[PDB]
Amino acid sequence: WEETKECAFTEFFKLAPLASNPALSVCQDASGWQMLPPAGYPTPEQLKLMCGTAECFTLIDAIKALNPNDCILVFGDVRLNVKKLVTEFEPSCF
Ligand SMILES: [Cl-]
Ligand code: NI
């Protein structure tokens, strides 16, 4: 995955549909992991919770549908590759 090349700020705007998707709130509240604003990659504790929450799978699929780029999204000190996150999520659960 891309670990150096940074996303243009416009990449953030791709995430807009998530705010009107109920799965976002359910997943974030259940796990303590935040996508908006982005906290980064889920911690193992957060991932455990996400992997047992149907809505987190729904959320991850909804992010995939936005076609996130393979680049580092920079939000203050938070740095993550959203495409990496969503592609690796399902296998990370087991
Ligand atoms: Cl900094
Ligand atoms: Ni890589």
Side-chain angles (χ1 to χ4, degrees):
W1 298 102
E2 186 57 55
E3 303 291 345
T4 301
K5 186 164 65 181
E6 291 166 14
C7 308
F9 188 83
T10 52
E11 188 75 10
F12 281 103
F13 301 141
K14 286 185 187 177
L15 305 175
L18 303 181
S20 51
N21 188 327
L24 178 71
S25 173
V26 178
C27 181
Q28 292 184 153
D29 291 354
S31 68
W33 171 75
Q34 312 304 134
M35 180 69 250
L36 301 179
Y41 299 105
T43 64
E45 289 82 6
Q46 288 163 352
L47 185 60
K48 184 98 265 184
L49 284 158
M50 289 174 76
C51 293
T53 305
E55 289 88 355
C56 290
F57 292 83
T58 304
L59 174 60
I60 290 291
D61 290 350
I63 302 163
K64 283 181 179 175
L66 313 171
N67 297 314
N69 286 339
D70 191 357
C71 53
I72 295 289
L73 191 66
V74 177
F75 185 78
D77 285 352
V78 174
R79 296 166 50 87
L80 81 167
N81 183 320
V82 176
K83 194 178 177 185
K84 177 178 185 182
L85 164 73
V86 300
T87 303
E88 292 190 338
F89 174 75
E90 280 196 77
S92 80
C93 287
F94 65 93

